[PDB]
Amino acid sequence: IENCVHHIKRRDIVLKWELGEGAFGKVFLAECHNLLPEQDKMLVAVKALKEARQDFQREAELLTMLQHQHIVRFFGVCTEGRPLLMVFEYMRHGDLNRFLRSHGPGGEDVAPGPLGLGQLLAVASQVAAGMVYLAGLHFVHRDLATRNCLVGQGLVVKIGDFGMSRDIYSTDYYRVGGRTMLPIRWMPPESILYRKFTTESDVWSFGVVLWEIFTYGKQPWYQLSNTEAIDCITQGRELERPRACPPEVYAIMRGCWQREPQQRHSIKDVHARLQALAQAPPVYLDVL
Numbered sequence: 039i040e041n042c043v044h045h046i047k048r049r050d051i052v053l054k055w056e057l058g059e060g061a062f063g064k065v066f067l068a069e070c071h072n073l074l075p076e077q078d079k080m081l082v083a084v085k086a087l088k089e090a091r092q093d094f095q096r097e098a099e100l101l102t103m104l105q106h107q108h109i110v111r112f113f114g115v116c117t118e119g120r121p122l123l124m125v126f127e128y129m130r131h132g133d134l135n136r137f138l139r140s141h142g143p144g145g146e147d148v149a150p151g152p153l154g155l156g157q158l159l160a161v162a163s164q165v166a167a168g169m170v171y172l173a174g175l176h177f178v179h180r181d182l183a184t185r186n187c188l189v190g191q192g193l194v195v196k197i198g199d200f201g202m203s204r205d206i207y208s209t210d211y212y213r214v215g216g217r218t219m220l221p222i223r224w225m226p227p228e229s230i231l232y233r234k235f236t237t238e239s240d241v242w243s244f245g246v247v248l249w250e251i252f253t254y255g256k257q258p259w260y261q262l263s264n265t266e267a268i269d270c271i272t273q274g275r276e277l278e279r280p281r282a283c284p285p286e287v288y289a290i291m292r293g294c295w296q297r298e299p300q301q302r303h304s305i306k307d308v309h310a311r312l313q314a315l316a317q318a319p320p321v322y323l324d325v326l
């Protein structure tokens with residue numbers, strides 16, 4: 039809400055079970071029939087609105103607008119019978135924070151043990167690609183963090199969420215008075231102090247996403263309370279270099295974390311550097 043529509047017949051959606059819950063809705067896994075030509079049956083994630091209606095139409099418009107190779111695919115809505123539904127792509131590894139933790143200190147998509155440096159960089163690059171697209175359309179996320187990315191088959195990583203991160207990951211937010219919940223640990227000085235949010239508050243957040251990736255999904259400033267974390271951020275402390283993170287990747291983080299918004303590197307450059315590294319041969323990466 040800070041920044042055409044496909045429609046799906048209720049009968050074509052068959053709910054299977056709940057994936058998660060919140061204050062403003064529930065998410066289910068469902069079979070969707072006649073959605074794509076190739077697949078006559080297919081799995082999808084369905085967001086059910088608690089039941090509001092105006093916001094829904096507006097959000098649905100924007101979600102349909104924002105479609106990219108690294109943005110969670112939105113198929114359309116179901117406005118036939120209440121409750122209103124939003125239909126998204128099903129991403130089988132769930133959110134990126136959960137995926138990182140479950141492969142940190144085997145299977146179909148990933149090797150045993152912690153994810154190697156090349157895997158971590160591929161993840162980083164895809165999220166960066168996603169924010170390039172968003173910056174290019176001049177969309178400000180406001181809550182970029184690994185919990186708001188999803189991991190699919192073949193370790194495809196895409197930006198997107200179902201609006202329940204405040205409920206599932208409540209410790210990642212600071213309740214400031216009543217009903218406002220801020221992802222302070224992911225926010226730069228200008229958002230905490232002045233309450234400004236821009237493309238460059240998002241680069242900062244990406245920098246913190248990069249730290250999350252390289253710490254296997256650990257919470258930023260985990261050693262601190264919320265007030266202590268606000269103190270450190272506003273006073274200008276930068277997160278330390280993760281053990282798994284080599285100097286050159288850490289240098290990418292710091293460019294995201296320049297205190298002054300204009301001195302931060304553009305997302306396009308962050309991506310270009312991370313892609314290169316992700317697409318670099320084992321001989322070059324083994325030496326990083």
Ligand SMILES: CC(C)(C)c1ccc(C(=O)Nc2cc(-c3ccccc3)nn2-c2ccccc2)cc1
Nearest residue numbers: 039062097104109110179197198199200201202204
């Ligand atoms: C990356 C894309 C463009 C796909 C994107 C960007 C932003 C959001 C988003 O803004 N999500 C989001 C936050 C809350 C939210 C709820 C309560 C309090 C504070 C924030 N709801 N939603 C939500 C609502 C309807 C559908 C899906 C997500 C999603 C995707």
